[PDB]
Scaffold this motif. Sequence first.
Motif, short mmCIF file in Angstrom:
data_model
loop_
_atom_site.label_atom_id
_atom_site.label_comp_id
_atom_site.label_asym_id
_atom_site.label_seq_id
_atom_site.Cartn_x
_atom_site.Cartn_y
_atom_site.Cartn_z
N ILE A 34 -31.68 25.65 21.11
CA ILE A 34 -31.10 24.91 22.18
C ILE A 34 -29.59 24.97 22.12
N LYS A 35 -28.99 24.65 23.24
CA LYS A 35 -27.57 24.42 23.21
C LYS A 35 -27.28 23.02 23.78
N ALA A 36 -26.11 22.48 23.45
CA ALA A 36 -25.75 21.13 23.90
C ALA A 36 -24.27 21.00 24.19
N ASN A 37 -23.92 20.05 25.08
CA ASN A 37 -22.52 19.72 25.32
C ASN A 37 -22.34 18.25 25.72
N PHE A 38 -21.20 17.71 25.38
CA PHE A 38 -20.95 16.34 25.64
C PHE A 38 -19.56 16.00 25.19
N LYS A 39 -19.17 14.81 25.58
CA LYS A 39 -17.86 14.24 25.43
C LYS A 39 -17.98 12.99 24.53
N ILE A 40 -17.06 12.81 23.61
CA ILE A 40 -16.97 11.51 22.89
C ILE A 40 -15.60 10.90 23.19
N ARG A 41 -15.58 9.58 23.37
CA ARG A 41 -14.33 8.86 23.65
C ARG A 41 -13.97 8.06 22.40
N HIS A 42 -12.81 8.26 21.81
CA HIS A 42 -12.45 7.45 20.63
C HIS A 42 -11.32 6.53 21.02
N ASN A 43 -11.46 5.24 20.80
CA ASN A 43 -10.33 4.37 21.12
C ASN A 43 -9.13 4.60 20.20
N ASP A 309 -32.46 -0.30 37.00
CA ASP A 309 -32.81 -1.69 36.98
C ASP A 309 -31.77 -2.54 36.21
N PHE A 310 -31.92 -3.83 36.26
CA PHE A 310 -30.87 -4.64 35.81
C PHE A 310 -30.52 -4.39 34.35
N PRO A 311 -31.50 -4.43 33.43
CA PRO A 311 -31.21 -4.05 32.02
C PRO A 311 -30.56 -2.67 31.88
N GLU A 312 -30.93 -1.70 32.73
CA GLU A 312 -30.31 -0.38 32.59
C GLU A 312 -28.83 -0.43 33.00
N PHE A 313 -28.53 -1.24 34.01
CA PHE A 313 -27.19 -1.57 34.45
C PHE A 313 -26.39 -2.26 33.35
N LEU A 314 -26.93 -3.29 32.73
CA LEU A 314 -26.15 -3.91 31.66
C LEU A 314 -25.86 -2.93 30.56
N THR A 315 -26.81 -2.07 30.24
CA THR A 315 -26.57 -1.09 29.16
C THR A 315 -25.47 -0.12 29.54
N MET A 316 -25.53 0.42 30.75
CA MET A 316 -24.47 1.29 31.23
C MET A 316 -23.03 0.64 31.23
N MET A 317 -22.88 -0.60 31.72
CA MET A 317 -21.61 -1.29 31.79
C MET A 317 -21.17 -1.64 30.39
N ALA A 318 -22.12 -2.03 29.53
CA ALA A 318 -21.80 -2.30 28.14
C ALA A 318 -20.99 -1.13 27.61
N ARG A 319 -21.53 0.08 27.77
CA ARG A 319 -20.93 1.30 27.22
C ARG A 319 -19.59 1.61 27.94
N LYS A 320 -19.55 1.31 29.23
CA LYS A 320 -18.36 1.58 30.00
C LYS A 320 -17.22 0.68 29.53
N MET A 321 -17.54 -0.50 28.99
CA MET A 321 -16.51 -1.39 28.51
C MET A 321 -16.15 -1.13 27.07
N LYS A 322 -17.10 -0.71 26.25
CA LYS A 322 -16.84 -0.47 24.82
C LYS A 322 -15.84 0.70 24.66
N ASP A 323 -15.97 1.71 25.51
CA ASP A 323 -15.15 2.94 25.54
C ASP A 323 -13.97 2.74 26.48
N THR A 324 -12.95 3.58 26.35
CA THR A 324 -11.74 3.44 27.13
C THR A 324 -11.74 4.57 28.12
N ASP A 325 -11.32 4.27 29.33
CA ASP A 325 -11.25 5.29 30.35
C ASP A 325 -9.95 6.10 30.17
N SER A 326 -9.93 7.32 30.68
CA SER A 326 -8.72 8.14 30.67
C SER A 326 -7.81 7.73 31.82
N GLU A 327 -6.56 8.20 31.75
CA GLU A 327 -5.60 7.94 32.85
C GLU A 327 -6.14 8.41 34.18
N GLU A 328 -6.66 9.63 34.19
CA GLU A 328 -7.23 10.26 35.38
C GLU A 328 -8.27 9.31 35.98
#
Length: 391
Positions: A34-43, A309-328
Amino acid sequence: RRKWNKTGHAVRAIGRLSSLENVYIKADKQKNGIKANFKIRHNIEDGGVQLAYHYQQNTPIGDGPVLLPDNHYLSVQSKLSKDPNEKRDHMVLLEFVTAAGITLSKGEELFTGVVPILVELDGDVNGHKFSVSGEGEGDATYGKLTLKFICTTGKLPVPWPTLVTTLVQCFSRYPDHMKQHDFFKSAMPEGYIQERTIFFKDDGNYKTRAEVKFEGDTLVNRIELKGIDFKEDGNILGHKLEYNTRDQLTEEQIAEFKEAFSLFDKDGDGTITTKELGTVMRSLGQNPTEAELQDMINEVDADGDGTIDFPEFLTMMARKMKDTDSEEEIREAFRVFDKDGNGYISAAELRHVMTNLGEKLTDEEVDEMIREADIDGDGQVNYEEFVQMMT
Ligand SMILES: [Ca+2]
Ligand SMILES: [Ca+2]
Ligand SMILES: [Ca+2]
Ligand SMILES: [Ca+2]
């Protein structure tokens, strides 16, 4: 008044659904792997993100037939902590890892109970050499790992979080309808070679090669790592990255996410459909296709039902807040309000947003919103003020 949050969070939600945050896996027939790709965000300790772009490949060590997956992803929750009695440079790591991304084998047998793990790493980054040993266990039934790593050479010359991806995806949980896509266990016991190159934006890169396989009853990951071109005062060699996970489900925060969630779930059924996601995006002036709606959703759709669904939403936002967004990314969000891109959200602009959102506010209530955000007093919200508001 502080009703910047609901709208802030909805824009932030669309940002998440619009990004690519999971670990994407694809078959690599030429290599029988297999091959894989992804991004990690480090604060970055004092604000900002250090991005790390990963490219990965895996081939079986043995000749036994293995499973070649359809495209899908893994989703990871990590928590890094310290052992209070440990005096050596170390990392305690707790991880849960689940497969998804596809909508509704013999080596798998080796992973039905708790399996011990040993990790061994030798590295060299800009000439700075080091080793890490780790030990613990893996419980694939839950996609769980608990491990303790020790820098066996003294002080680790890079921050520990930069090594987490390099330091056993055979421990991930594939749900029942995806078991045929688990290349990692199917390669076992004899295992696989895992190679990566990892680019740290504005900085150096790591090249890794590892062998992952059973030795006795123990699952072992033996790794070499080479980093080059690192800046002596960059985030890596300068040690400017946060260690602490920052994993704070603050409950008034959950309530803030519920409020945003309801903007999308306008029939109040506790799930978000493509219809609903579309409606919100048009209101904000985008125009996604039916397919883009399916992909956005699929990006956070843990059960594969096609809806957030709602739990899937909380999980997604959880992660969106734990990590930092880029300037872009913060800029793109800003532009959702800055309709003419002059650098300034005007009273008229925020009206147009709120009105198109179906939010019932008065030219007086809109005025109050600016005031709450307008630090410098110019009657407008500029980039920095937006940033402060969004924190
Ligand atoms: Ca709904
Ligand atoms: Ca779902
Ligand atoms: Ca403007
Ligand atoms: Ca201002």
